[PDB]
Amino acid sequence: VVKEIPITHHVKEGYEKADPAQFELLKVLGQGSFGKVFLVRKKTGPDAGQLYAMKVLKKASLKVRDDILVEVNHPFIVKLHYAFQTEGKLYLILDFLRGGDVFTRLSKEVLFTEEDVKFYLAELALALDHLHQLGIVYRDLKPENILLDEIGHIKLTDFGLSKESVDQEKKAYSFCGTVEYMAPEVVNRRGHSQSADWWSYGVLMFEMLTGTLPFQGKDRNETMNMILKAKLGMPQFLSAEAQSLLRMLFKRNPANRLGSEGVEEIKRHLFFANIDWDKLYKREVQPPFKP
Ligand SMILES: Nc1ncnc2c1ncn2[C@@H]1O[C@H](COP(=O)(O)OP(=O)(O)NP(=O)(O)O)[C@@H](O)[C@H]1O
Ligand SMILES: Nc1ncnc2c1ncn2[C@@H]1O[C@H](COP(=O)(O)OP(=O)(O)NP(=O)(O)O)[C@@H](O)[C@H]1O
Ligand SMILES: [Zn+2]
Protein backbone atom coordinates (compact mmCIF):
# COMPACT_ATOMS: atom_id res chain seq x y z
CA VAL A 1 0.00 0.00 0.00
CA VAL A 2 1.20 3.50 -0.88
CA LYS A 3 1.93 5.38 2.34
CA GLU A 4 2.69 9.10 2.51
CA ILE A 5 5.32 9.98 5.13
CA PRO A 6 5.31 13.69 6.04
CA ILE A 7 8.76 15.32 6.31
CA THR A 8 9.02 17.66 9.31
CA HIS A 9 12.24 16.79 11.18
CA HIS A 10 15.64 15.29 10.33
CA VAL A 11 19.03 15.05 11.88
CA LYS A 12 21.83 13.05 10.41
CA GLU A 13 23.38 10.47 12.74
CA GLY A 14 26.03 12.06 14.94
CA TYR A 15 24.78 15.64 14.83
CA GLU A 16 22.21 17.96 16.44
CA LYS A 17 18.89 19.58 15.51
CA ALA A 18 19.25 22.66 13.28
CA ASP A 19 17.26 25.89 12.89
CA PRO A 20 17.40 28.71 10.33
CA ALA A 21 19.77 30.96 12.33
CA GLN A 22 22.61 28.42 12.19
CA PHE A 23 23.00 29.00 8.46
CA GLU A 24 24.40 32.02 6.65
CA LEU A 25 23.63 32.82 3.00
CA LEU A 26 26.44 33.00 0.45
CA LYS A 27 24.86 32.98 -3.01
CA VAL A 28 21.97 31.36 -4.91
CA LEU A 29 22.91 28.10 -6.65
CA GLY A 30 19.91 27.72 -8.85
CA GLN A 31 16.20 27.74 -9.35
CA GLY A 32 13.90 24.77 -9.80
CA SER A 33 10.21 24.47 -10.20
CA PHE A 34 9.85 24.37 -6.40
CA GLY A 35 11.98 27.36 -5.61
CA LYS A 36 15.53 28.47 -5.25
CA VAL A 37 18.55 26.60 -4.02
CA PHE A 38 20.89 28.76 -1.92
CA LEU A 39 24.48 28.14 -0.91
CA VAL A 40 24.79 28.37 2.89
CA ARG A 41 27.56 28.16 5.46
CA LYS A 42 26.89 26.49 8.78
CA LYS A 43 27.66 29.07 11.49
CA THR A 44 27.94 26.96 14.66
CA GLY A 45 28.31 23.41 15.94
CA PRO A 46 30.48 20.43 14.94
CA ASP A 47 30.00 21.22 11.24
CA ALA A 48 30.56 24.97 11.61
CA GLY A 49 32.16 26.38 8.44
CA GLN A 50 30.81 23.57 6.27
CA LEU A 51 28.95 24.39 3.04
CA TYR A 52 25.48 23.13 2.25
CA ALA A 53 22.75 23.50 -0.37
CA MET A 54 19.49 24.82 1.05
CA LYS A 55 15.97 24.42 -0.08
CA VAL A 56 13.01 26.42 1.14
CA LEU A 57 9.58 24.85 0.70
CA LYS A 58 6.11 24.85 2.22
CA LYS A 59 5.58 21.13 2.75
CA ALA A 60 7.36 17.93 1.71
CA SER A 61 6.33 14.29 2.10
CA LEU A 62 7.62 10.96 0.83
CA LYS A 63 5.41 8.27 -0.69
CA VAL A 64 6.57 4.71 -0.08
CA ARG A 65 5.00 1.34 -0.84
CA ASP A 66 4.72 -0.90 2.31
CA ASP A 67 14.88 5.42 8.91
CA ILE A 68 13.61 6.27 5.39
CA LEU A 69 15.58 9.52 5.28
CA VAL A 70 18.67 7.44 6.08
CA GLU A 71 17.86 4.51 3.78
CA VAL A 72 17.73 6.74 0.69
CA ASN A 73 21.49 7.29 1.10
CA HIS A 74 23.39 6.19 -2.00
CA PRO A 75 26.67 6.97 -3.83
CA PHE A 76 24.72 8.75 -6.56
CA ILE A 77 21.96 10.49 -4.61
CA VAL A 78 22.19 13.74 -2.67
CA LYS A 79 22.35 13.45 1.07
CA LEU A 80 19.88 15.28 3.26
CA HIS A 81 21.67 16.48 6.38
CA TYR A 82 18.89 18.30 8.08
CA ALA A 83 15.23 19.11 7.76
CA PHE A 84 13.25 21.49 9.97
CA GLN A 85 10.08 23.59 10.23
CA THR A 86 9.81 27.28 11.16
CA GLU A 87 7.34 30.09 10.41
CA GLY A 88 5.25 28.14 7.92
CA LYS A 89 8.37 26.92 6.09
CA LEU A 90 10.16 23.62 5.61
CA TYR A 91 13.92 23.90 5.24
CA LEU A 92 15.95 21.17 3.62
CA ILE A 93 19.66 21.14 4.19
CA LEU A 94 21.51 19.24 1.55
CA ASP A 95 24.81 18.13 0.12
CA PHE A 96 26.22 20.92 -1.98
CA LEU A 97 27.25 19.67 -5.35
CA ARG A 98 30.01 21.65 -7.03
CA GLY A 99 29.97 20.20 -10.54
CA GLY A 100 26.87 21.66 -12.20
CA ASP A 101 24.43 19.63 -14.30
CA VAL A 102 25.48 16.96 -16.77
CA PHE A 103 23.93 18.72 -19.75
CA THR A 104 26.02 21.88 -19.16
CA ARG A 105 29.24 19.88 -18.96
CA LEU A 106 28.32 17.93 -22.11
CA SER A 107 27.48 21.17 -23.97
CA LYS A 108 31.06 22.21 -23.17
CA GLU A 109 32.37 19.54 -25.53
CA VAL A 110 32.35 19.75 -29.32
CA LEU A 111 31.41 16.07 -29.54
CA PHE A 112 31.24 13.03 -27.29
CA THR A 113 30.71 9.30 -27.50
CA GLU A 114 28.26 6.59 -26.53
CA GLU A 115 30.83 5.52 -23.90
CA ASP A 116 30.64 8.85 -21.98
CA VAL A 117 26.87 8.80 -21.92
CA LYS A 118 27.10 5.14 -20.83
CA PHE A 119 29.03 6.16 -17.73
CA TYR A 120 26.19 8.56 -16.77
CA LEU A 121 23.32 6.20 -17.63
CA ALA A 122 24.94 3.43 -15.58
CA GLU A 123 25.36 5.44 -12.37
CA LEU A 124 21.84 6.83 -12.87
CA ALA A 125 20.44 3.30 -13.29
CA LEU A 126 21.94 2.27 -9.94
CA ALA A 127 20.40 5.35 -8.22
CA LEU A 128 16.91 4.72 -9.60
CA ASP A 129 16.94 1.04 -8.74
CA HIS A 130 18.08 1.88 -5.23
CA LEU A 131 15.02 4.08 -4.70
CA HIS A 132 12.71 1.45 -6.24
CA GLN A 133 13.93 -1.22 -3.82
CA LEU A 134 12.81 1.07 -0.99
CA GLY A 135 9.38 1.30 -2.63
CA ILE A 136 10.09 4.87 -3.75
CA VAL A 137 9.31 6.39 -7.13
CA TYR A 138 11.34 9.31 -8.53
CA ARG A 139 8.28 10.57 -10.35
CA ASP A 140 9.87 13.52 -12.13
CA LEU A 141 13.31 12.61 -13.49
CA LYS A 142 14.62 15.51 -15.59
CA PRO A 143 18.03 16.80 -16.74
CA GLU A 144 17.98 19.58 -14.15
CA ASN A 145 18.00 17.02 -11.31
CA ILE A 146 21.18 15.35 -12.53
CA LEU A 147 24.28 17.10 -11.23
CA LEU A 148 27.99 16.33 -11.07
CA ASP A 149 30.11 16.24 -7.92
CA GLU A 150 33.69 17.49 -7.83
CA ILE A 151 35.15 14.39 -9.43
CA GLY A 152 32.58 14.15 -12.19
CA HIS A 153 30.31 11.54 -10.62
CA ILE A 154 26.49 11.78 -10.86
CA LYS A 155 24.21 13.04 -8.09
CA LEU A 156 20.41 13.22 -8.20
CA THR A 157 19.19 16.43 -6.55
CA ASP A 158 16.24 14.69 -4.91
CA PHE A 159 14.98 11.19 -4.08
CA GLY A 160 11.28 11.45 -4.91
CA LEU A 161 10.09 14.01 -2.35
CA SER A 162 6.53 15.20 -2.92
CA LYS A 163 7.09 18.92 -2.56
CA GLU A 164 5.16 22.17 -2.16
CA SER A 165 6.52 25.61 -3.05
CA VAL A 166 6.26 28.45 -0.57
CA ASP A 167 5.78 31.15 -3.25
CA GLN A 168 2.02 31.32 -3.24
CA GLU A 169 1.74 32.13 -6.86
CA LYS A 170 3.93 29.21 -7.96
CA LYS A 171 2.06 26.83 -5.73
CA ALA A 172 -1.22 28.04 -7.24
CA TYR A 173 -0.45 26.76 -10.76
CA SER A 174 1.51 23.60 -9.86
CA PHE A 175 0.60 20.19 -11.26
CA CYS A 176 2.45 16.85 -11.57
CA GLY A 177 5.79 16.59 -13.42
CA THR A 178 7.54 17.73 -16.61
CA VAL A 179 5.45 16.46 -19.50
CA GLU A 180 8.35 15.89 -21.97
CA TYR A 181 9.64 13.12 -19.71
CA MET A 182 6.32 11.46 -18.83
CA ALA A 183 5.50 7.89 -19.78
CA PRO A 184 2.21 7.40 -21.71
CA GLU A 185 0.41 5.92 -18.71
CA VAL A 186 1.44 8.90 -16.52
CA VAL A 187 0.06 11.20 -19.20
CA ASN A 188 -3.06 9.06 -19.06
CA ARG A 189 -3.30 9.79 -15.33
CA ARG A 190 -3.02 6.10 -14.36
CA GLY A 191 -0.37 7.01 -11.77
CA HIS A 192 3.41 7.09 -11.32
CA SER A 193 5.38 3.85 -11.14
CA GLN A 194 8.88 2.33 -11.15
CA SER A 195 8.32 1.44 -14.79
CA ALA A 196 7.48 5.09 -15.56
CA ASP A 197 10.85 6.08 -14.15
CA TRP A 198 12.43 3.73 -16.69
CA TRP A 199 10.53 5.45 -19.49
CA SER A 200 11.86 8.83 -18.23
CA TYR A 201 15.29 7.22 -18.21
CA GLY A 202 14.82 6.26 -21.87
CA VAL A 203 13.84 9.81 -22.82
CA LEU A 204 17.00 11.13 -21.13
CA MET A 205 19.06 8.56 -23.07
CA PHE A 206 17.53 9.68 -26.39
CA GLU A 207 18.04 13.38 -25.58
CA MET A 208 21.65 12.85 -24.49
CA LEU A 209 22.53 10.80 -27.60
CA THR A 210 20.76 13.02 -30.17
CA GLY A 211 20.71 16.48 -28.61
CA THR A 212 16.95 16.40 -29.14
CA LEU A 213 13.77 15.45 -27.25
CA PRO A 214 11.79 12.59 -28.82
CA PHE A 215 8.35 14.19 -28.33
CA GLN A 216 7.72 17.91 -28.14
CA GLY A 217 5.01 20.08 -29.67
CA LYS A 218 3.83 23.68 -29.81
CA ASP A 219 2.18 23.33 -26.40
CA ARG A 220 1.17 20.99 -23.61
CA ASN A 221 -1.69 19.25 -25.44
CA GLU A 222 0.29 18.56 -28.62
CA THR A 223 3.27 17.23 -26.65
CA MET A 224 0.95 14.87 -24.78
CA ASN A 225 -0.65 13.62 -27.98
CA MET A 226 2.78 13.01 -29.49
CA ILE A 227 3.82 11.05 -26.40
CA LEU A 228 0.76 8.86 -26.81
CA LYS A 229 0.52 8.55 -30.58
CA ALA A 230 3.40 10.08 -32.58
CA LYS A 231 6.02 8.32 -34.69
CA LEU A 232 9.63 8.10 -33.59
CA GLY A 233 12.45 7.24 -35.97
CA MET A 234 15.50 5.35 -34.71
CA PRO A 235 18.73 7.44 -34.83
CA GLN A 236 20.80 5.51 -37.38
CA PHE A 237 24.15 6.78 -36.09
CA LEU A 238 23.83 4.79 -32.84
CA SER A 239 25.36 1.34 -32.39
CA ALA A 240 23.11 -1.72 -32.45
CA GLU A 241 23.38 -2.06 -28.66
CA ALA A 242 22.24 1.51 -28.02
CA GLN A 243 19.42 1.09 -30.57
CA SER A 244 18.39 -2.05 -28.71
CA LEU A 245 18.32 -0.46 -25.22
CA LEU A 246 16.34 2.48 -26.63
CA ARG A 247 13.94 0.13 -28.37
CA MET A 248 13.37 -1.83 -25.16
CA LEU A 249 12.84 1.22 -22.95
CA PHE A 250 10.35 2.90 -25.28
CA LYS A 251 7.37 0.63 -24.74
CA ARG A 252 4.20 2.66 -24.21
CA ASN A 253 2.79 -0.10 -22.04
CA PRO A 254 4.62 -0.74 -18.75
CA ALA A 255 5.52 -4.36 -17.72
CA ASN A 256 6.36 -4.63 -21.36
CA ARG A 257 9.08 -2.09 -20.65
CA LEU A 258 12.67 -2.91 -19.69
CA GLY A 259 13.22 -2.36 -15.96
CA SER A 260 9.67 -3.09 -14.84
CA GLU A 261 11.09 -6.35 -13.47
CA GLY A 262 14.05 -4.75 -11.69
CA VAL A 263 17.34 -3.39 -12.96
CA GLU A 264 19.03 -6.79 -13.48
CA GLU A 265 17.88 -7.03 -17.09
CA ILE A 266 19.15 -3.46 -17.52
CA LYS A 267 22.58 -4.24 -16.06
CA ARG A 268 22.79 -7.36 -18.23
CA HIS A 269 21.87 -5.55 -21.47
CA LEU A 270 24.49 -5.75 -24.24
CA PHE A 271 24.83 -1.95 -24.06
CA PHE A 272 26.31 -2.14 -20.56
CA ALA A 273 28.39 -5.31 -21.23
CA ASN A 274 31.44 -3.06 -20.80
CA ILE A 275 30.60 -2.00 -17.20
CA ASP A 276 31.85 -3.50 -13.89
CA TRP A 277 28.84 -2.62 -11.74
CA ASP A 278 30.62 -3.37 -8.45
CA LYS A 279 33.47 -0.98 -9.32
CA LEU A 280 30.90 1.53 -10.57
CA TYR A 281 29.02 1.48 -7.29
CA LYS A 282 32.26 1.95 -5.36
CA ARG A 283 33.06 5.02 -7.46
CA GLU A 284 36.26 3.38 -8.63
CA VAL A 285 35.39 3.90 -12.31
CA GLN A 286 36.89 6.97 -13.96
CA PRO A 287 34.42 9.72 -15.07
CA PRO A 288 34.67 10.88 -18.72
CA PHE A 289 34.94 14.59 -17.78
CA LYS A 290 36.30 16.64 -14.93
CA PRO A 291 33.92 19.43 -14.03
N1 LIG B 1 22.43 20.22 -3.67
C1 LIG B 1 22.63 21.08 -4.69
N2 LIG B 1 23.85 21.61 -4.94
C2 LIG B 1 24.06 22.47 -5.95
N3 LIG B 1 23.10 22.88 -6.79
C3 LIG B 1 21.83 22.44 -6.66
C4 LIG B 1 21.52 21.49 -5.58
N4 LIG B 1 20.20 21.22 -5.68
C5 LIG B 1 19.71 21.92 -6.73
N5 LIG B 1 20.68 22.65 -7.32
C6 LIG B 1 20.50 23.54 -8.49
O1 LIG B 1 19.26 24.23 -8.39
C7 LIG B 1 18.39 23.94 -9.49
C8 LIG B 1 17.09 23.34 -8.97
O2 LIG B 1 17.24 21.93 -8.82
P1 LIG B 1 16.01 21.03 -8.31
O3 LIG B 1 16.46 20.26 -7.09
O4 LIG B 1 15.44 20.28 -9.50
O5 LIG B 1 14.93 22.13 -7.85
P2 LIG B 1 13.46 21.69 -7.38
O6 LIG B 1 12.58 22.91 -7.49
O7 LIG B 1 13.61 21.03 -6.03
N6 LIG B 1 12.86 20.49 -8.51
P3 LIG B 1 12.40 20.96 -10.13
O8 LIG B 1 11.02 21.54 -9.98
O9 LIG B 1 12.44 19.68 -10.92
O10 LIG B 1 13.45 21.96 -10.54
C9 LIG B 1 19.12 22.97 -10.41
O11 LIG B 1 19.23 23.54 -11.72
C10 LIG B 1 20.47 22.71 -9.76
O12 LIG B 1 21.57 23.08 -10.61
N1 LIG C 1 5.99 5.21 -4.18
C1 LIG C 1 4.97 4.95 -5.04
N2 LIG C 1 4.73 3.70 -5.48
C2 LIG C 1 3.73 3.43 -6.34
N3 LIG C 1 2.90 4.36 -6.83
C3 LIG C 1 3.02 5.66 -6.47
C4 LIG C 1 4.09 6.04 -5.54
N4 LIG C 1 4.00 7.37 -5.36
C5 LIG C 1 2.95 7.81 -6.11
N5 LIG C 1 2.37 6.79 -6.77
C6 LIG C 1 1.21 6.91 -7.69
O1 LIG C 1 1.10 8.25 -8.16
C7 LIG C 1 -0.17 8.83 -7.83
C8 LIG C 1 0.05 10.10 -7.02
O2 LIG C 1 -0.35 11.23 -7.79
P1 LIG C 1 -1.65 12.09 -7.36
O3 LIG C 1 -1.39 12.67 -5.99
O4 LIG C 1 -2.88 11.25 -7.61
O5 LIG C 1 -1.64 13.30 -8.43
P2 LIG C 1 -0.25 13.79 -9.09
O6 LIG C 1 -0.39 15.27 -9.34
O7 LIG C 1 0.01 12.89 -10.27
N6 LIG C 1 1.03 13.55 -7.93
P3 LIG C 1 2.47 14.54 -8.00
O8 LIG C 1 3.08 14.23 -9.35
O9 LIG C 1 3.31 14.09 -6.83
O10 LIG C 1 1.97 15.96 -7.87
C9 LIG C 1 -0.96 7.80 -7.03
O11 LIG C 1 -2.20 7.54 -7.69
C10 LIG C 1 -0.07 6.57 -6.93
O12 LIG C 1 -0.68 5.40 -7.50
ZN1 LIG D 1 2.01 13.35 -10.89
Swiss-Prot record:
Residues covered by the Protein kinase domain: 23-272
- Protein name, please? Ribosomal protein S6 kinase alpha-6
| Family membership | Belongs to the protein kinase superfamily. AGC Ser/Thr protein kinase family. S6 kinase subfamily.
Stated consequence of mutating Y82C: In a lung large cell carcinoma sample; somatic mutation
Record function comment: Constitutively active serine/threonine-protein kinase that exhibits growth-factor-independent kinase activity and that may participate in p53/TP53-dependent cell growth arrest signaling and play an inhibitory role during embryogenesis.
**Whom does it interact with, and what assembly results?**
Forms a complex with MAPK3/ERK1 but not with MAPK9 or MAPK14 in serum-starved cells.
Residues involved in ATP binding: L29, G30, Q31, G32, S33, F34, G35, K36, V37, K55
Q: Where in the cell is it found?
A: Cytoplasm, Cytosol; Nucleus
Q: Which organism is it from?
A: Homo sapiens (Human)
PTM Phosphoserine: list the residues.
Answer: S174
Catalytic positions? Answer: D140
- What gene name does this entry carry? RPS6KA6
